[PDB]
């Protein structure tokens, strides 16, 4: 190991945001603080000087952004309430309003977050699990934090993935979330402006490890068309990818890369098949320097390859 | 799941002690409190009313006993110092003197603990990992807590298993500990009263997952003879057993039962091959009610079988 990688909590929550290839990665250290590593031409930071807040030990860690002008990072307090670390270009980091709403969730809740796509307005949807084990949506629309739609029961401690996109022929944003049900299947729920939340749960994988990590991305929104990727940790201790491709739907799935037992996962993407893309990056723990966070890369140039072997501070 | 199961921390530390088939099992709840479940002809307790103290979330949990007259449970504080919860018959539960010593360890340290075998005196050896990644022994021999022998370097965040026994032809106790080295091997170190700590590390498993759980027991101590069993979580997400049997040494090894990814493990035994024994019990998480602690059984009559599906509070 290394002294730096020794600072990364084993099975830490991981989240990532980006503006094309300007990347930020959030993780928790062994004392419970949440740190930011970055990629701006090269990898940097992730030290005790790069802490954006503190969270309960073992906390989920989720994030979303509008490019890098606005970033929000979501974690649990000691009292099991949702909280938010916020960055706005020209203000810096501050403790965001979410904490003041005091939304109590299950102690074992995960979190996902999206800014709604296709608008310059700052509109947030956050998803977590209540003590009754239902997935609850929370909303920010300029005018305070409030509860949105409840999306029903899920496996207690399920991972939660989410993405927002805007079809080019639609008048408003779409949302897709994925989570695990009590029968251990992984499923999709969906929101479109004309149908609200579709009533049906779409199974994407028949059987996954209980409480397995779940992360998702989308890219290349066209007219009634989208590309999506969903990642989870399977029973072979590897990340699997499930693919949605326009014209084929959910058509493929298979192993991507090995990880440590119980690794968390984050995914980011940019570009499109139409313009020499997409670019995909996964972050996870595969046991490099024992406890470092590693990267995986997909691009047009080389397809599937390992990336940065060990992120800062390793 | 059940409301009770849901209180149990996912990948909680687990320890157990016994007097023959009178059993106690220790685990951490989602709020960080350590709780006791018990078997006295039937399973009971494990609730918020059976809290014996509080430890940092994710803490290792270790325990040792002299029958059930004296029980000692070891965890880590928020401050990353060793602490102890103590039970003496006639006194009940109290905060033990270990915390007063303020032994600072690595944030990712595990713990093992033994009462030295074959004496009525209360002599304790505790094992943990310091910030420099060396295994340190800490000692209580009646005149306060102090540092004992340093047993050198190990994988940062290694599991630690330990046992004490006293050969019937010896006039002092023996001790064996097991842990993982930087090369991912699982090894034994050994103390006998004539050789002190043997210089050599003996390899018991070529390669195991990083920071895999490690637990050990011994039984049937005779004239320069002993039986030992060591358990860890292998890459196939099962507990594997390694056996020391008198005559054969370290001769056999294989899977026992499936567990969740990154499950912790505890072991207890009683009896011996001479007396229609031994009896073994293993505690672990295998996904029963998602987060419940499960039991595996070995006994002469029926051999290997799953035991209590879900311990209290499940
Ligand atoms: C077609 C294209 O322009 N792709 C770039 C990609 O470069 C391609 O793939 C890499 C692996 C290398 O073979 C290049 O020659 C090839 O063009 C960029 O990746 C960076 O490439 C440079 C060299 O030009 C370095 O290898 C650098 O490490 C690569 O950065 C990667 O992506 C970063 C955003 C981080 O995730 C980093 O850890 C990765 O290694 C990328 C980044 O600009 O952009 C296209 O994909
Ligand atoms: C169930 C349903 O169809 N509700 C919509 C509501 O959608 C909300 O946002 C969507 C994306 C999703 O998260 C739903 O669960 C959630 O209820 C609509 O809310 C507006 O959505 C747009 C983006 O589509 C903006 O975010 C806008 O700020 C939202 O309106 C605000 O929230 C509403 C609940 C109202 O309180 C309104 O006063 C707010 O301005 C609304 C249209 O308002 O339509 C259904 O209620
Ligand atoms: C390396 C070595 O051989 N040291 C011994 C020391 O062994 C200690 O205990 C053993 C089992 C092991 O944990 C070692 O790492 C540790 O240093 C002996 O200590 C005594 O051990 C017996 C049991 O065999 C009793 O536990 C007794 O209380 C111990 O004596 C006390 O501790 C010693 C360090 C002395 O300070 C003594 O005055 C204490 O009463 C001693 C024999 O005393 O011999 C080597 O130091
Ligand atoms: C390509 C480009 O112009 N990128 C900009 C970044 O380089 C800027 O990063 C900020 O740079 C200043 C020094 O000029 C300083 O290093 C700031 O700490 C750094 O901010 C980083 O990026 C932010 C989005 C946050 O994640 C913050 O924690 C980081 O430290 C940023 C400033 O907003 O603008 C980019 O466009
Ligand atoms: C320099 C500047 O004016 N920046 C804008 C912020 O002030 C705005 O943040 C919101 O400001 C209001 C005050 O009217 C209040 O402080 C809100 O808490 C704050 O909202 C934050 O951002 C939201 C998107 C949420 O994440 C909320 O929980 C945060 O606390 C924002 C408007 O979002 O724009 C900045 O540019
Ligand atoms: C079925 C039965 O009663 N078995 C005996 C146990 O009850 C004894 O333990 C103590 O019993 C008293 C009853 O007056 C009371 O229930 C105590 O709480 C109980 O203590 C338990 O055992 C201790 C060793 C600790 O683990 C403690 O936390 C437990 O709650 C035992 C020995 O005292 O003997 C059984 O035969
Ligand atoms: C009735 C009675 O007195 N029983 C003995 C206990 O008092 C002993 O506990 C130790 O007592 C001393 C002197 O008061 C001091 O309080 C110690 O802290 C305490 O030691 C505890 O037990 C040890 C074995 C260690 O675990 C230590 O950290 C604990 O705090 C005990 C131990 O000698 O024996 C009872 O019989
Ligand atoms: C100590 C306990 O051992 C087993 O208990 C058995 C009982 O379930 C019952 O079958 C009787 C039959 O008379 O045999 C016991 O040995 C475990 O099942 C139990 O969980 C305890 O570990
Ligand atoms: C963007 C790429 O899309 C498909 O071609 C998949 O085969 C790859 O894994 C990658 O997700
Ligand atoms: C005590 C028992 O010993 C041998 O029979 C092993 O095959 C069993 O797994 C058990 O350890």
- For chain B, the structural domain boundaries read 1-314
Does any ligand 4 atom lie closer than 6 A to the CB of residue A200? no
Q: What is the distance between the alpha carbons of residues B62 and A10, in angstroms, rounded to a whole number? A: 19
- Which chain A positions have a beta carbon within 8 Å of B56's beta carbon? 57
Query: Alpha helices, DSSP H only, in B12-166?
Result: 98-101
Q: What is the distance between the alpha carbons of residues A253 and A238, in angstroms, rounded to a whole number? A: 13
**Domain at B1-314: CATH code:** 2.120.10.70
The rounded Å distance from CA B278 to ligand 10 centre is 9
Q: What is the distance between the alpha carbons of residues B280 and B4, in angstroms, rounded to a whole number? A: 26
Which residue from B133, B157, B209 is facing A261, i.e. has the nearest CB? B209
CB contact burial B44-56 (16+ within 10 A = b; e otherwise)? ebbeeebebbbbb
Q: What is the 8-class DSSP label of residue A200? A: P
CA distances from A42 to A21, A23, A308 (A): 11, 10, 10
Closest CA to B152 of B171, B132, B138, B168: B132
Looking at chain A, which residue has its C-alpha nearest residue B212?
A261
Three-state DSSP class for residue B61? coil
The rounded Å distance from CA A22 to ligand 4 centre is 9
Binding residues of B: 24, 36, 43, 72, 84, 93, 97, 125, 137, 145, 149, 176, 188, 197, 229, 241, 243, 245, 251, 281, 295
The answer for residues whose C-beta is within 8 angstroms of residue B163's C-beta and 6 or more apart is B114, B175, B176, B177, B216, B217, B218, B228
Longest Cα–Cα distance in chain B: 53
Q: What angle do CA A60, A2, B60 make, to 5 degrees?
A: 50
Q: What is the distance between the alpha carbons of residues A28 and A24, in angstroms, rounded to a whole number? A: 14
**Residue A196 corresponds to which tokens in the numbers above?**
């609200």
Q: What is the 8-class DSSP label of residue A98? A: H
Other C-beta atoms lying within 10 Å of the C-beta of residue B274:
9
Q: What is the distance between the alpha carbons of residues B100 and B78, in angstroms, rounded to a whole number? A: 14
The answer for residues whose C-beta is within 8 angstroms of residue A207's C-beta and 6 or more apart is A184, A185
Binding residues of A for alpha-L-fucose: 24, 36, 43, 72, 84, 93, 97, 125, 137, 145, 149, 176, 188, 197, 229, 241, 281, 295
Structural resolution in Å: 2.0
Pair B280, B297: CB distance under 8 Å: yes
DSSP E strands in B20-116: the ranges are 22-28, 33-39, 43-45, 51-54, 62-66, 70-76, 82-88, 92-95, 111-115
Closest CA to B20 of B267, B228, B270: B270
- Which chain B positions have a beta carbon within 8 Å of A56's beta carbon? 57
Q: What is the distance between the alpha carbons of residues A53 and A51, in angstroms, rounded to a whole number? A: 6
Q: What is the distance between the alpha carbons of residues B179 and B2, in angstroms, rounded to a whole number? A: 35
Looking at chain A, which residue has its C-alpha nearest residue B1?
A156
């Amino acid at each position: 190991s290394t002294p730096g990688a020794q600072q990364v909590l084993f099975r830490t929550g991981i989240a990532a945001v980006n503006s094309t290839n300007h990347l930020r990665v959030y993780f928790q250290d062994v004392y419970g603080s949440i740190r930011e590593s970055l990629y701006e031409g090269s990898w940097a930071n992730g030290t005790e000087k790069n802490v954006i807040g503190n969270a309960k030990l073992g906390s989920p860690v989720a994030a979303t952004s509008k490019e890098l002008k606005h970033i929000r990072v979501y974690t649990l307090t000691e009292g099991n309430t949702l909280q938010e670390f916020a960055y706005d270009s020209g203000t810096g980091w501050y403790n965001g309003g979410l904490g003041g709403a005091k939304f109590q969730v299950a102690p074992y809740s995960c979190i996902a977050a999206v800014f709604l796509a296709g608008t310059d307005a700052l509109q947030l949807r956050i998803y977590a699990q209540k003590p009754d084990n239902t997935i609850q949506e929370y909303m920010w629309n300029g005018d305070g934090w409030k509860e949105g739609t409840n999306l029903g029961g899920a496996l207690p401690g399920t991972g939660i993935g989410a993405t927002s996109f805007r079809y080019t022929d639609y008048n408003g944003p779409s949302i897709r979330i994925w989570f695990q049900t009590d029968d251990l299947k992984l499923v999709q729920r969906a929101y479109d402006p004309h149908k609200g939340w579709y009533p049906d749960l779409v199974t994407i994988f028949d059987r996954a490890p209980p409480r397995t990590a779940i992360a998702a991305t989308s890219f290349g929104a066209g007219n009634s068309s989208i590309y999506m990727r969903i990642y989870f940790v399977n029973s072979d201790n590897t990340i699997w990818q499930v693919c949605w491709d326009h014209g084929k739907g959910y058509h493929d799935k298979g192993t991507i890369t090995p990880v440590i037992q119980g690794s968390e996962v984050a995914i980011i993407s940019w570009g499109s098949f139409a313009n020499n893309g997409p670019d995909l990056r996964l972050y996870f723990q595969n046991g490099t320097y024992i406890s470092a966070v590693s990267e995986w890369v997909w691009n047009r140039a080389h397809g599937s390859q390992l990336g940065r072997s060990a992120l800062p501070p390793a």
